[PDB]
């Protein structure tokens, strides 16, 4: 079965403005490959093709791509979910971010926002425990839905809000990560996180548009995590 | 700030729920709209009220709303503080416009 | 100088659990430190890791550092270098409870404490009953460990050249390693990141095979570089092949799998496992299992169906509710990977490449060694080497499942804390010269020049193949020393070997290639260690020389770059805490 | 100066973010039909015969489409704006089911009272 693919191009030492270029590629009839397969055969063929990834297990989070105008990850989409007689499969950059090369984003402000947060444990050292910190099943239930992001960033660039103001909002994938430390039994600085989070725009330019939840390619819902930060926002300065 | 912005956005919402609900009440039950029952209606000190804490809640409500609009579409500074401008006044005037015309019936 | 001239205490090449806990260390101990990485820290194959850190905290159960330094020291069927074990099991809990002070979100026992669950090769009282010792976080432990070490660098300010592929060591006049050159990825600019300290963490090289559990980027660049250089590699021969990989994908499922009750049935739905290892089962060393599964399948007692040649890991009788809550990672994956919901119906797995016991031989405090004429050790001067990468040696002819997380933390951490004493002991290293630095970019320039040659996919593809076949589970002599013939044409093919893609923006050909140099150098090293153990140990195992043999063999094997060819290092067997455990027979 | 794909022809948007565009551009209307609805206000108010003035203008085909446009916004305005403010208050999961489901039934809800409205005016 012949596959057919529209792929976004674009080298700064060569191209004016990007561009879309076709690819061809014969694939076993009684077999589903990933796309990140097919990227890979692809680039045997077009060695100047670049994109991102490493695990082809769906963990790394290397590469979030825009495929037929929904992002994910390439390496747990099959062709067969993208594949429609007469359409071409469209693989494009994450939205958004600025364009490296080809497939490649600068996941640049993606990370600020992440750092913004301060994405680690807070603990003021009082109280210490014996051993470990003592967290009750209950308390570590908590953080799931949360610890596991992979900071793919297929939510973030998926949000409008996101794509307005890059570099004021959070964005969901980082709001998610403020949430897993905003509930972690053993931070301490609750009240002082809160307070970097009261502006007009780090949290509250999530208006629901719920983008973010239909991509994660974990399951995750950054919508709700930012619905208990507001909670918590609310009860704090309210 | 944020919190101040979302909760202001939701009282009027409130108060703005409860004035449609009050006049489409008056629409959907009046009958015959002659100009008798219509200036009869705006007459009312309840009717004079409502219509001017609904013009202030407006006057919050839909600053806070187009300011997210703009701050959202409109980078440049100078373009986006002029049509700041532009709604702020045309929410006052609205308000103002509102006291004018109930203190004439 | 032509190049920039990015000057730092230390260097630290990986950001994989050991260099982001070196560099964390190295940092706070006052030194500058450059940590660089040829992917973003947290895409690093730690993300990966599934089951857990294999460290005698005593939550379960009562446990005992020396009864997790025996089921160490006799999983590593007596090659493991008995005082750094000792050191690593020692010293494990206070580094793992460090860890989870950090913020590490380890799954918990009813009374707060970090969840353990049983895996391969742990036992209480020096081989008696089947222990518990793995902390985890579901079976996404590896995940959680690099996001909360990424979190740490973070916080504490860590200088990170992210996407930096590493290209070269750079020596002087003298021998020493004084820093090494770096290719920029985004801009293709080249550098030499120069420094007292060259600390070596590039992790494990998988895609030497066919089929691996490793991530693409797991090209044993580490051992490419130590033997361009000059510094030998240790152990090379000692390959582990996983028991339960995803048969048709390669994919990795968890011993957690087994140790949370979980087993493995062969066509007739025999548990084998009983047959094969009668006390541990399917908790039996990895080795083990992993020639059990493949004997099952040689003589034609393994399933077959669209995954190929495999046996059956049930899980079901576990039920939905522990499945999904400590093992939800490989629900995905055999969901995704195999079409096979592990709730109702079994995984197809077959053994698969997935971790290098070899590489640079390392002291405690992460100092590189050489050997000199006599075959004494020698300290390389400016190299250090933690994590995969390194053969310290903690893990012998065969690692237990959970001490790879443990000895990333413990020594990632020992270097650093070592790091001033190592600098003092070593002296002032004396400046690289304009052609010291030069030597260290032949292999890139080779690569750019080269238009009309070879096509690198073809080698690659070949090169892979002949591991497959030559140096898998079951070695044979023959097919051992035709292998490595079949190695040294393609090695010969691959200096011809052609780049196409000239570009400088984000060229990950030209990254590839360069991989290749280094999948190339990590398979003639095996190939030629393992044709030179005659014996089998461990993972290493032989139909010519099919017994142990503690006479000859009972020592390190020793690939030496100039010469190419091959000598032996001593095991260390003086712990100093307790009394060595002496080589006997080694049965599950 | 670096590209970005931002081509909005390029991407899908769930039935969730085009509920929500709607909402943005239901409130920039709204925020002009005040204006609108005052000026009619006032010119029905001034007099008998601003009254009658007023009744000539909403009887131009016109207006009364203007006018319908302005309720169906207005309606539209509403109706989202009590389903957000039900996920706020924790009445309306946060689940995307959930959010498609609701997103659904505003619409459904909406077109209902824009029907009214068309009677209101007709
Ligand atoms: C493959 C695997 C291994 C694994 C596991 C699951 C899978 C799928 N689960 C484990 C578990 O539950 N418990 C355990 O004890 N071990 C487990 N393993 C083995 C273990 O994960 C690995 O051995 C370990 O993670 C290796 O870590 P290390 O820090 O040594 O290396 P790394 O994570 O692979 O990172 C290497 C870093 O080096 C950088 N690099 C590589 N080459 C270059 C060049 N040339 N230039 C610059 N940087 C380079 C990489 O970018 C990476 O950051
Ligand atoms: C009366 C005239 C009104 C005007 C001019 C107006 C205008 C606006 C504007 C401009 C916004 C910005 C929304 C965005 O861009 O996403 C908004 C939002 C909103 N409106 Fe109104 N509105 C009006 C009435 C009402 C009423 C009666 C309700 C009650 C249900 C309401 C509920 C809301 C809510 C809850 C939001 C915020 C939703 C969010 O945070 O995304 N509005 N409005
Ligand atoms: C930023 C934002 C909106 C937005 O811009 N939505 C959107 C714009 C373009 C394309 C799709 C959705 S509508 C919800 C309120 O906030
Ligand atoms: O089985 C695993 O989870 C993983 O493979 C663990 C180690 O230690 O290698
Ligand atoms: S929340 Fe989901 S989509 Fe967003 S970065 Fe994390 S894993 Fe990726
Ligand atoms: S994050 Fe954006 S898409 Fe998410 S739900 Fe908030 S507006
Ligand atoms: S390659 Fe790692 S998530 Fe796709
Ligand atoms: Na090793």
């Given at each position: 079965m012949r596959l057919e693919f529209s792929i976004y191009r674009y080298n700064p030492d060569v191209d004016d403005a990007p561009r879309m270029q076709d690819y061809t590629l014969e694939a076993d009839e009684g077999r589903d490959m990933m796309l990140l397969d097919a990227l890979i055969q692809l680039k045997e063929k077009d060695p100047s093709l670049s994109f991102r990834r490493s695990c082809r297990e769906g963990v790394c989070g290397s590469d979030g791509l825009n495929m037929n105008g929904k992002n994910g990850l390439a390496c747990i989409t099959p062709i067969s979910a993208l594949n429609q007689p007469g359409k071409k499969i469209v693989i494009r950059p994450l939205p958004g971010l600025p364009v490296i090369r080809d497939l490649v984003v600068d996941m640049g402000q993606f990370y600020a926002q992440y750092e913004k947060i301060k994405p680690y444990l807070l603990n003021n050292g009082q109280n210490p425990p014996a051993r470990e910190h003592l967290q009750m099943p209950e308390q570590r239930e908590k953080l799931d839905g949360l610890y596991e992001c992979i900071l793919?960033?297929?939510?973030?660039?998926?949000?409008?809000?996101?794509?307005?103001?890059?570099?004021?909002?959070?964005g969901p994938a980082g709001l998610l990560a403020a949430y897993r430390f905003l509930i972690d039994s053993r931070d301490t600085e609750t009240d002082s996180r809160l307070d970097g989070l009261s502006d007009a725009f780090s949290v509250f330019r999530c208006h629901s548009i719920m983008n973010c939840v239909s991509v994660c390619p974990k399951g995750l819902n950054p919508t709700r995590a930012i619905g208990h930060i507001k909670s918590m926002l609310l009860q704090r300065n309210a | 700030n944020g919190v101040h912005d979302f909760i202001l956005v939701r009282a009027t919402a409130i108060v703005l729920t409860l004035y449609i609900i009050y006049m489409v009440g008056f629409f959907a039950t009046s009958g015959e709209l002659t100009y008798e029952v219509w200036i009869g209606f705006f007459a009312s000190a309840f009717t004079k009220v409502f219509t001017l804490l609904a013009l202030f809640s407006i006057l919050i409500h839909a600053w806070i709303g187009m300011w997210q609009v703009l701050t959202d579409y409109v980078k440049p500074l100078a373009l986006r503080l002029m049509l700041q401008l532009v709604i702020v006044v045309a929410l006052v005037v609205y308000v103002i416009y509102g006291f004018v015309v109930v203190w004439g019936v | 100088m032509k190049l920039p001239?990015?000057?730092f205490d230390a260097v630290v090449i990986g950001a994989g659990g050991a260099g982001m806990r070196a560099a964390l260390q190295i940092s706070q101990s006052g030194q500058t430190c450059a940590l660089l990485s040829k992917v973003f820290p947290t895409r690093s194959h730690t993300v990966s890791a599934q089951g857990g850190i294999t460290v005698a905290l005593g939550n379960t159960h009562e446990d005992n550092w020396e009864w997790h330094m025996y089921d160490t020291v006799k999983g590593s069927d007596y090659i493991g270098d008995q005082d750094a074990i000792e050191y690593m099991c020692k010293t494990g809990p206070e580094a793992i409870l460090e860890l989870e002070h950090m913020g590490l979100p380890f799954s918990r026992?009813?009374?707060?404490?970090?969840?353990?669950?049983?895996?391969g090769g742990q036992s209480k009282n020096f081989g008696g009953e089947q222990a518990a010792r793995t902390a985890a976080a579901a079976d996404r432990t590896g995940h959680a460990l690099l996001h909360t070490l990424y979190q740490q660098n973070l916080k504490n300010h860590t200088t990170i050249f992210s996407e930096w592929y590493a290209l070269d060591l750079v020596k002087n006049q003298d021998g020493a390693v004084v820093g090494c050159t770096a290719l920029c990825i985004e801009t293709g600019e080249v550098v030499y990141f120069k420094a007292r300290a060259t600390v070596l963490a590039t992790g494990g090289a998988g895609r030497i095979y066919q089929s691996t559990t490793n991530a693409h980027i797991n090209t044993g660049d580490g051992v490419g570089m130590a033997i361009r250089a000059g510094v030998p590699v240790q152990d090379m021969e000692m390959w582990q092949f996983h028991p339960t990989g995803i048969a048709g994908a390669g994919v990795l499922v968890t011993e957690g799998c087994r140790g949370e009750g979980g087993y493995l049935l062969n066509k007739h739905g025999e548990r084998f496992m009983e047959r094969y290892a009668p006390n541990a089962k399917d908790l039996a060393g990895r080795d083990v299992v992993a020639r059990s599964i493949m004997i099952e399948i040689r003589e034609g007692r393994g399933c077959d169906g669209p995954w190929g040649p495999?046996?059956?890991?049930?899980?079901?009788?576990?039920?939905?509710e522990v499945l999904e809550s400590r093992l939800p990672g490989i629900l995905e994956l055999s969901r995704t990977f195999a079409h096979v919901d592990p709730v109702k119906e079994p995984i197809p797995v077959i053994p698969t490449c997935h971790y290098m016991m070899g590489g640079i031989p390392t002291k405690v405090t992460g100092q590189a060694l050489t050997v000199n004429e006599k075959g004494e050790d020698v300290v390389v001067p400016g190299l250090f080497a933690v994590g995969e990468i390194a053969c310290v040696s903690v893990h012998g002819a065969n690692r237990l499942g959970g001490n790879s997380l443990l000895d990333l933390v413990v020594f990632g951490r020992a270097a650093g804390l070592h790091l001033q004493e190592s600098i003092a002991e070593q002296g002032a290293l004396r400046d690289a010269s304009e052609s010291d630095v030069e030597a260290s970019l032949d292999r890139l320039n080779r690569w750019n020049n080269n238009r009309n040659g070879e096509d690198p996919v073809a080698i690659r593809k070949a090169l892979q193949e002949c591991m497959q076949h030559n140096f898998s589970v079951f070695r044979e002599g023959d097919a051992m020393?035709?292998?490595?013939?079949?190695?040294k044409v393609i090695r010969e093919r691959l200096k011809n070997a052609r780049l196409d893609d000239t570009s400088s923006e984000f060229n990950t050909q030209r990254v590839e290639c360069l991989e290749l140099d280094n999948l190339m150098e990590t398979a003639y090293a095996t190939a030629v260690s393992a044709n030179f153990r005659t014996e089998s140990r461990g993972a290493h195992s032989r139909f010519d020389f099919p017994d142990r043999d503690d006479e000859n063999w009972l020592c390190h094997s020793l690939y030496l770059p100039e010469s190419e060819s091959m000598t032996r290092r001593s095991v260390n067997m003086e712990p100093k805490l307790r009394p060595a455990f002496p080589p006997k027979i080694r049965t599950y | 100066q670096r590209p970005v794909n931002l081509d909005l022809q390029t991407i899908r948007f769930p039935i969730t973010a085009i509920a929500s565009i709607?909402?943005?551009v239901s409130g920039v209307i709204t925020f002009v039909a005040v204006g609108i609805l005052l000026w009619l206000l006032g010119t029905s108010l001034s007099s008998p015969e601003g009254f009658e003035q007023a009744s000539a203008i909403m009887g131009s085909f016109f207006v009364k489409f203007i006018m319908w446009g302005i309720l169906t916004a207005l309606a539209y305005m509403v109706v989202v704006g009590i389903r957000h403010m039900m996920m706020d208050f924790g009445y309306l999961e946060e689940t995307f089911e959930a959010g498609k489901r609701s997103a659904k039934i505003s619409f459904v809800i909406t077109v209902v009272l824009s029907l009214l409205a068309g009677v209101l005016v007709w």
């Open positions: 793919c960033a297929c939510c973030s660039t998926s949000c409008p809000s996101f794509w307005w103001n890059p570099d004021k909002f959070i | - | 001239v990015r000057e026992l009813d009374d707060g404490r970090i969840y353990q669950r049983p895996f495999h046996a059956k890991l049930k899980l079901d009788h576990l039920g939905k020393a035709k292998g490595l013939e079949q190695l | 709607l909402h943005r």
